Each structure stands twice: as structure tokens, then as C-alpha cells.
Design a protein around this ligand. Structure first.
Ligand code: HEC
Ligand code: HEC
Ligand code: NI
Lengths: 493, 77, 339
């Protein structure tokens, strides 16, 4: 049905009509598309609301457009929608202890509400979960008074219902007709590698589209898929593209003919790739793949972009020996750096188009494991939840001709796991926690109690992730904890 | 702390107070209903005191019936 | 089913489905099982002064039931949501009068309206046990927030665990601080941390709880023991070890009071005087609650799954396991008494 009629038929009765399609609570809050879905889902689980998936989708679309957030109101907290669950949040202590000790603090920041709606929210928490005020970081203080007198007013000032951003967004919001066309994309999947190609977006009913992804990874594995997408609030792109045997969700922000976000497996959000794209019509230079060239070396480098025309210049000391291919969105070439080429970044160019840098290096000095800290989780083995992999990359660092630090990039390496502490050695964590594969992907053990372990415990572990560079054997260290599952997994962490 | 783990360590769920997994429950199933009955970790573990009262219906014995525990978010389809 | 024998020692424990089992302490076997009404949660039980009636906080922290162990009959029932439009929950907060004529419960109510919730101030509600299966508040007083465990002393006074431990008059409802915790302005130390959902009815007749405290991040973590003598009202606190691991429950041996036993992942035996660990034992799995029999010859470990571990407190070794019918004991507290 239409958004307004469904709003009344399904919410009225509990929510009071206030005039021209506005209802109590509902019309006094602004959230992201997944935020709206989460509120409605709570209505079903907690309050018995009867609603089909189709009608729920209709209401989310309606509410996400009417009461959404301006792009700048999501700045810095987009990792939540992008399902980057290993993100180490950086909010003030008051918000962290009071509001981010259960779920993320980003779930809070991705909403805009007046003080009374923030006050109703506090009452709902302590009301729905009475044990709240007896838990850690709550039993040590007068939780309710502090939350109502200190927190509510702060939340209202930091995340108000009304703002210039939202007002100016409602007027400057572009239509979905601005998205169809060809889109050159570039991206990177941790522990897998670079990806590049072209995404064809064609219109469909309303704010939905047909999507076609055509590309490949740097290693030759294909990246071709077909799917669809919807556009919320003029910029919030949500898509699903079946690439091979996996359905990948796309959570991008489509602004100024540029799409930025993340594409991940609908079923496994640790398995994804960073994604940046540019619409045809504007000359852009997206990326260099690889973004590094060892001095005195030969390497196949490919440039990704939009409207590429001209001759590629990779900077001082770097020689373009054979342009293997040159289309407007992809330029493949063979390059060679002199053994004398000075270490440092090079401003790459294709004709007059500049934008990306190429690190020319002589030797690797320091290595950093990315991510430095992460969470792997046991799963499957009959359980209702999947295993959450640890996916790593070895980030190389050196020094340029000026003695300043130089980030080379992600260099190939050998991967292993070692006990993080004496306790891990004693419990034999490295034996039960799972298996580190050569490619840098750690596959945790199966869920459930394990009879073979002390106290028949789970295949959990406190591990040290060691990467050793193929280029010179320089080592890097990371920290990974393999833990238990979680069954409550809403759209936003 | 990580965005998709809890920070309320009593002793915890993803990570204990000590920053590891040893002070946690062994196995986790032994502390599962201790976590669930009073909604101690509602964002990760489903609450049986209020929201998901019959969550462990087919798994009264968590040591042997842990596989019967389902996910709670009403996903499409 | 079978009535309990006089002079015989017994132990009650609640199990998941919704059972209350009677364990014959002499033979370490299940004497009888009673199916409980409604739903389980938390299943926390305490024996009435009659050594025959068990009062249980069940049905998702919203009701209190009285079950006669000799027949498994539901003789009392008090719902904690008697105020119109409000849902009342008890965070393990209930106690039985010394004469067994009244039951107290602090209720944290929430007014649930059509489109929002409103948390209301807590209140103590008194129920007469003679009122049967439809018992309602006969007296109610205002209570501070964050109140959990409560135990009625011999002189009718009610010791209430909240931000501070209070001593409350159940007739006037007036209370004073019996033992400062949050407001324990102890220099060189931080405020203590207390997490306890196990109202042990131990042979020593005292309301005891473990706590942790930082002694000035460089602060030194210590474990302490707090206690309220239910006979004389005498209070006591004292740290007994530097924290190297966590314990959920801890009890002093009725055999040797200078020894305190704590449990969670390991069962530890400490010397109170010396503030020294004398011995620790590894467990088959995590256990929450300790329970000592009358003489202190046995140490039962409950909570968690469906089995009781029986330990010899001297050697600190598991003698046997009592497998309970059904499932997880969860946060239940094993209660020992002489019939
Ligand atoms: C600071 C006082 C807090 C603020 C602000 C918010 N929360 Fe929470 N919260 C918790 C749960 C279990 C849920 C939802 C259930 C689920 O995740 O499956 C939430 C949800 C929210 C929401 C979503 C609201 C909506 O959709 O209408 C918001 C905006 C929110 N929370 C804000 C749990 C907890 C919790 C642990 C006991 C605490 C301390 C907080 N939440 C604190 C805050
Ligand atoms: C009656 C059984 C309900 C129906 C049908 C709907 N809602 Fe509701 N809603 C209800 C209550 C008792 C409450 C307050 C407590 C709570 O769960 O938050 C609400 C609240 C909301 C909110 C506020 C959420 C917040 O975090 O502040 C929203 C945004 C909301 N409800 C939306 C909503 C919509 C869109 C509905 C139509 C599908 C709807 N509710 C129906 C009870 C009931
Ligand atoms: Ni280093």
C-alpha cells in the first residue's frame, strides 16, 4: 500500500494520530534505513505487531525518506551500517559507559531526536531490561538520575531532531534519476586483494534499480554479478548482487556521482571489500593496482578510473614498458623501476588526470598487521550461527629519500598463529581455536563445548597473529581473540 | 573493545574483564542461561526475563541441546 | 510424593524446565521432584522457618510461590504486579519473616502505556502467607533503587542489599544504613563492587556476600567478605586475598570459619587470617554456587548445568556428581536444611 495508509492501519491503536499522517513517537525521530527496520522489528518481537515483510519494506522506505539523516549527520559512524564490527569506537566516556556498553555507540549517533524522545528511550531501556541498573558501569552509580539529568540533555544537544543539515538536505536531495549509467569501481578485500570493474546501473520501478557488476580481482578471479538496489533518502544506496555463489550486500553513500561504501557477504559481514566508484561523465582517477613498485623491479600495474585519456606517467624512476591495454576505465601496463629510483610516492597521471600515488621503495623497514585487533567467533557445527573469520593483511612501511616514513602498501606474507599469553599456551589455544591459512584467513573452530578441552570448553582462544614478509622476512604482529557466538544480530551493531 | 562485543564484563561474553577469554564461562554454555534469564547481555544474548521468554524451549539442557538455540532478529523471509 | 523424614538433612535446588528437587544429603541422591507452576526464572528458593515450605521467585522475576515439599503442593502465590497498568519485577529481592507469616519483596515496576514506558520508583510489598494463591499487598513502603538480596533477621528486622546495606523496620518502613558500601568512604580504597544473586541459608545463619575492592592503574585488586549476623545484627567485612581470578559465590566452612571457599572456574580454599590461598581445585566446568551441609563435611557446587558436584572440603576433591532430572540450574541457589 502507500506509506501513509499502512502507517495508520498498522501503527494506529498503539500510536496516537496527531494530524495529517503524523503519529506519536513515530513522527518525532529520524533514523537510517536499518534504524527504521529495527524499530518496526521491535514492534513485532516485543509488542506483537502483525506485518508482512513486503509491507515492512514499504514502511521502511516511507519512513527512511520522510525522516532520515542528512549525509553529514552520518559522518564518522557509517561503519555501523557497513557492518564493520571490528571497529574500535571512539566516543566520550559518558556516552560509552551509559550508552555503548551493550550495543555500539554508533547505533545512538545514527539517530536524531528531541529531548523527550531521548527521555522515553531511557525509560524503555530500564523498563524492558530491569537488570540494566545492576550491571557493570551502572551498579556503581545512580544510573536513572544520571541518564535523565545528564545524558538525555547531552543526547538532545548532540543529536537533535532539527538541524540545518536536515533542512538543507530535504531541499537539495537529488532524485534517483541521477544514478543510472556506467560506474567504474575499485575496491579491496582483506586477505583476498584488489578488485576493479564496471557497475551498470539501470532504472526499474521507482527508486529501485537493476545492477550489473563486471570485473575481476587482481589475482584473476572473476567479479561478475547481477542484482538490484534501492535508494533511500536520495543517497543511501542498499543493494544485493549475486556474484558467483554468494549474495553480496552493498551499503554505499551515493553522492556527487560517486559511490563510497562496503560490499560484503549477506551472510558473513567480515567477508567484504572496501568499495569506491565513479559515474561516467566526469574524469576521475580511482586507483593504481598495485600501489607500490619495488626499486629495480618489473610489475604489471593497472590504473582504474573514469574518462582515462592520455599517456600514463608514473613518476621519476618508473618506466612504462608496455601498455597491455587502454580503455577509458582501465589501463593495464608493464612497468619497471630503476634500481636507482629514489624511494617515495609518485603522483601518477594519465594525460592531465592526477589523483593517485605510487610508492616506489627500496627496502621494507616496519610491518603492521591490519587489523591490529579483531574478533573471530566460533560457529556452525550444528549451530544457528556462522563462523566469523579473522582476515588479515600485512602493511609494509619504509622510508623515502627524505628520511620520512613511507607506507608501501599491503605486501604478500606468510601467516601463523602463536599463543598470546602464558594462559593460551597452557590451554592449548593454538590447537583448538582454529586454523590459520596461508592466505591470511583464520577459520575458527566449531561451536559448542569441546570434550577434548579442559572443562570441555569451547574452541575459543587468545591469539597472536604473525605475518612474515615474503620480501625480506620482516615480521609484523597482530592480536586476535576467537570467542563465542551472539544470537541477537540486528542490522546495526 | 570492538563495536559488535559487549563492554559490560560480569565477567563478559566476547571478552572478560581481564581482556581475554579465560575468566569467561567454561564452556560458555555453563553461563548461557545465567546471562539469558536476567537479560544481562540483551544486545548479544536473548533475554528470557522479558523479550524472548521461551528462547530455550528446545534446549533446557544447554550442555547437550545448544544447537537448538536460534537467532532472534526477524529477518526478511 | 514421599514426605520428608524428620531429623534428615535435605537440599533444594531448582532445575530448568520448572522443577524443584529435594536432595537427600545422606545418600547424595534425589529424594523427590516437584513440578513448579507457570514458568522458570530465576527459580531462586529459600526455606521457610517450618523446614517444610520453600518460597520461590519464579515466572520471570514476577511472582513468588510457596511449595510444600512433603506433597509438592502450591500453597502460596503472590503476583508482583498488583498496581493497575504496571509490570513489577524483583531482582532476586524477597525474604521470609522469622515466624514465616509474611513475605517481603521489593518491586521495580514499569508503567507500560500504549506508546511508551515510564519507570516508577521501587517499593517493598508485604504479603501474608495465609492469603493463599491470590495474595495481595497488605502493606507497601517506598524503596531506594538498585536493591537486590534481602534477609530477615531474627528480631524481625530486614537487611536490604542496595547501594548500601540497609536495616529496615517492616512495620514503619523506615530504614538506616547498616553497612556502607557505595558510601563507604574508606581512604586508600575505592568503593566496593558487589554482584550477588545467591541468598545462602548457611549453617552460620548469616547474610554473606563477596565483594571486590581496589586498594590504591596501580590499584591493587582484592576480594572481600561481608556478613550480617542474623541473630545479633552484627556486621563484618574483611579482605581475604589478592584477586587473581573471579569467584561468584563464597562461603565460610561451618566446620572451620577461618576457611572461606569461593567458586566459578576453580574452587579455591582460603585462609582468612593469613589472607592466603591454601588450595585450589580444577572443575569439570563452571559452577556458580557453593553450598555446605550442616557439619561442613561436604561442599556442593550447583548452578550452571544439571549436575551437583560433591566435594570433600578437606582434600578439595570431587567425591561424586548428582545428576538432576531435566536441564540447567542456571542462577539457582542450593539450600540446605534439617527437616
Ligand atoms: C544510553 C542510555 C543508550 C542509548 C541512547 C541507547 N541505548 Fe540501547 N538497546 C539495547 C537493546 C537490547 C536494544 C535493542 C534490541 C536489540 O538490539 O535487539 C537497544 C536499542 C537501542 C536503540 C534502538 C531504538 C529503536 O529502534 O527504537 C536506541 C536508539 C538505543 N538503544 C539507544 C540495550 C542497551 C543497553 C544494555 C542493557 C544499554 C546500557 C543501552 N542500550 C543504552 C542505550
Ligand atoms: C501496539 C501493540 C504497537 C503497535 C501496533 C506499534 N507500536 Fe510502536 N511502540 C509501542 C510501544 C508500547 C512503544 C514504546 C516502547 C518501545 O518499544 O519503544 C512503541 C514505540 C515505538 C517507537 C519509539 C522507539 C524508540 O526507541 O523510541 C517507534 C519509532 C515506533 N513504536 C514505531 C512503530 C511503527 C512504525 C509502527 C507501525 C508498523 C508501530 N510502532 C506499531 C507499541 C506499538
Ligand atoms: Ni615493527
Amino acid at each position: 500500500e502507500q506509506g501513509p495508509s499502512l502507517l495508520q492501519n498498522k501503527c494506529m491503536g498503539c500510536h496516537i494520530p496527531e494530524g495529517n499522517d503524523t503519529y506519536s513517537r513515530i513522527s518525532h525521530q529520524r533514523k537510517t534505513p536499518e534504524g527504521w527496520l529495527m524499530s518496526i522489528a521491535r514492534m513485532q518481537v516485543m509488542h506483537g505487531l502483525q506485518i508482512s515483510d513486503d509491507d515492512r519494506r514499504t514502511l521502511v522506505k516511507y519512513l527512511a525518506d520522510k525522516q532520515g539523516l542528512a549525509p553529514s549527520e552520518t559522518d564518522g559512524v557509517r561503519y555501523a551500517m557497513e557492518r564493520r564490527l571490528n571497529t574500535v569506537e571512539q566516543f566520550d566516556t559518558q556516552l560509552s559507559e551509559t550508552c555503548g556498553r551493550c550495543h555500539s555507540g554508533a547505533r545512538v549517533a545514527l539517530q536524531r531526536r528531541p529531548a523527550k524522545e531521548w527521555e522515553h528511550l531511557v525509560n524503555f531501556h530500564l523498563g524492558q531490561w530491569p537488570s540494566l541498573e545492576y550491571q557493570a558501569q551502572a551498579r556503581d552509580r545512580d544510573w536513572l538520575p544520571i541518564a535523565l539529568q545528564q545524558v538525555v540533555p547531552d543526547l538532545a544537544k548532540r543529536y537533535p531532531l532539527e538541524s540545518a543539515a536536515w533542512a538543507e538536505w530535504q531541499k537539495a536531495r537529488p532524485k534517483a534519476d541521477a544514478l543510472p549509467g556506467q560506474w567504474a569501481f575499485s575496491g579491496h578485500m582483506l586477505a583476498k586483494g584488489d578488485v576493479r570493474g564496471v557497475m551498470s546501473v539501470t532504472p526499474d520501478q521507482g527508486d529501485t534499480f537493476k545492477v550489473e557488476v563486471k570485473g575481476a580481482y587482481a589475482d584473476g578471479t572473476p567479479f561478475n554479478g547481477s542484482g538490484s538496489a534501492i535508494l533511500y533518502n536520495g543517497y543511501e544506496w542498499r543493494g544485493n548482487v549475486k556474484v558467483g555463489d554468494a549474495n553480496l550486500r552493498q551499503v554505499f553513500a551515493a553522492l556527487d556521482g560517486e559511490m563510497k561504501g562496503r560490499m560484503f557477504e549477506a551472510e558473513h559481514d567480515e567477508r567484504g571489500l572496501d568499495f569506491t566508484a565513479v559515474k561516467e561523465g566526469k574524469a576521475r582517477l580511482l586507483a593504481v593496482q598495485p600501489a607500490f613498485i619495488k626499486a629495480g623491479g618489473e610489475s604489471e600495474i593497472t590504473l582504474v578510473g573514469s574518462g582515462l585519456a592520455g599517456k600514463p606517467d608514473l613518476g621519476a624512476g618508473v618506466e612504462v614498458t608496455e601498455v597491455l591495454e587502454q580503455t577509458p576505465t582501465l589501463v593495464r601496463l608493464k612497468a619497471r623501476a630503476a634500481a636507482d629510483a629514489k624511494p617515495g610516492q609518485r603522483e601518477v597521471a594519465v594525460g592531465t588526470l592526477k589523483g593517485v600515488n605510487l610508492a616506489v621503495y627500496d627496502k621494507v623497514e616496519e610491518v603492521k598487521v591490519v587489523p591490529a585487533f579483531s574478533i573471530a567467533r566460533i560457529g556452525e557445527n550444528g549451530a544457528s550461527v556462522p563462523k566469523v573469520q579473522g582476515r588479515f593483511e600485512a602493511e609494509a612501511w619504509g622510508k623515502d629519500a627524505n628520511g620520512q616514513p613511507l607506507r608501501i602498501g599491503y605486501l604478500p606474507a606468510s601467516w601463523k598463529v602463536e599463543p598470546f599469553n602464558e594462559r593460551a599456551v597452557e590451554d592449548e589455544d593454538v590447537k583448538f581455536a582454529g586454523k590459520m591459512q596461508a592466505d591470511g584467513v583464520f577459520v575458527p573452530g566449531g561451536a559448542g563445548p569441546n570434550p577434548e578441552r579442559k572443562m570441555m570448553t569451547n574452541n575459543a582462544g587468545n591469539l597472536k597473529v604473525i605475518a612474515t614478509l615474503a620480501d625480506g622476512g620482516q615480521t609484523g604482529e597482530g592480536h586476535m581473540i576467537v570467542t563465542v557466538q551472539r544470537w541477537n544480530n540486528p542490522p546495526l551493531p | 573493545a570492538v563495536a559488535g562485543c559487549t563492554a559490560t564484563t560480569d565477567p563478559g561474553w566476547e571478552v572478560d574483564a581481564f581482556g581475554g577469554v579465560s575468566s569467561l564461562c567454561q564452556p560458555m554454555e555453563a553461563d548461557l542461561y545465567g546471562c539469558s534469564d536476567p537479560c544481562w547481555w540483551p544486545a548479544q544474548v536473548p533475554d528470557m526475563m522479558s523479550t524472548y521468554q521461551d528462547w530455550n524451549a528446545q534446549a533446557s539442557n544447554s550442555a547437550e541441546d545448544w544447537r537448538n538455540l536460534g537467532t532472534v532478529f526477524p529477518k526478511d523471509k | 510424593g514421599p514426605a520428608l523424614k524428620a531429623g534428615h538433612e535435605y537440599m533444594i535446588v531448582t532445575n530448568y524446565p520448572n522443577n524443584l528437587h529435594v536432595v537427600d544429603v545422606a545418600s547424595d541422591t534425589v529424594y523427590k521432584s516437584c513440578v513448579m507452576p507457570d514458568k522458570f526464572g530465576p527459580g531462586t528458593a529459600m526455606m521457610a522457618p517450618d523446614n517444610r515450605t520453600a518460597y520461590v521467585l519464579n515466572n520471570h522475576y514476577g511472582d513468588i510461590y510457596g511449595i510444600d515439599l512433603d506433597t509438592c503442593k502450591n500453597t502460596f502465590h503472590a503476583n508482583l504486579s498488583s498496581v493497575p497498568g504496571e509490570v513489577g519485577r524483583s531482582m532476586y529481592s524477597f525474604a521470609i519473616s522469622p515466624d514465616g507469616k509474611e513475605v517481603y519483596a521489593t518491586v521495580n515496576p514499569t508503567q507500560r502505556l500504549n506508546d511508551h514506558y515510564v519507570v516508577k520508583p521501587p517499593r517493598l510489598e508485604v504479603f501474608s502467607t495465609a492469603d493463599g494463591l491470590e495474595a495481595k499487598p497488605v502493606r507497601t513502603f517506598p524503596m531506594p533503587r538498585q536493591v537486590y538480596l534481602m534477609r530477615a533477621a531474627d528480631d524481625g528486622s530486614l537487611y536490604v542489599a542496595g547501594p548500601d546495606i540497609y536495616k529496615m523496620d517492616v512495620k514503619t518502613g523506615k530504614y538506616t544504613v547498616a553497612l556502607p558500601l557505595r558510601n563507604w568512604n574508606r581512604k586508600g580504597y575505592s568503593a566496593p563492587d558487589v554482584l550477588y544473586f545467591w541468598p545462602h541459608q548457611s549453617p552460620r545463619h548469616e547474610f554473606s556476600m563477596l565483594y571486590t575492592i581496589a586498594r590504591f592503574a596501580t590499584a591493587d585488586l582484592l576480594y572481600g567478605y561481608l556478613s550480617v549476623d542474623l541473630k545479633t545484627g552484627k556486621t563484618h567485612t574483611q579482605e581475604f586475598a589478592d584477586l587473581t581470578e573471579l569467584y561468584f559465590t563464597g562461603l565460610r566452612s561451618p566446620k572451620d570459619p577461618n576457611q572461606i571457599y569461593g567458586v566459578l572456574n576453580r574452587l579455591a580454599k582460603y585462609d582468612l587470617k593469613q589472607r592466603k590461598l591454601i588450595k585450589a581445585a580444577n572443575l569439570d566446568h563452571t559452577y556458580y554456587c557453593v553450598a555446605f551441609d550442616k557439619k561442613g563435611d561436604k561442599l556442593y557446587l550447583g548452578g550452571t548445568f544439571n549436575d551437583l558436584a560433591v566435594f570433600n572440603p578437606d582434600t578439595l576433591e570431587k567425591v561424586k556428581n548428582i545428576k538432576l532430572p531435566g536441564g540447567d540450574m542456571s542462577t539457582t541457589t542450593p539450600q540446605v536444611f534439617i527437616r
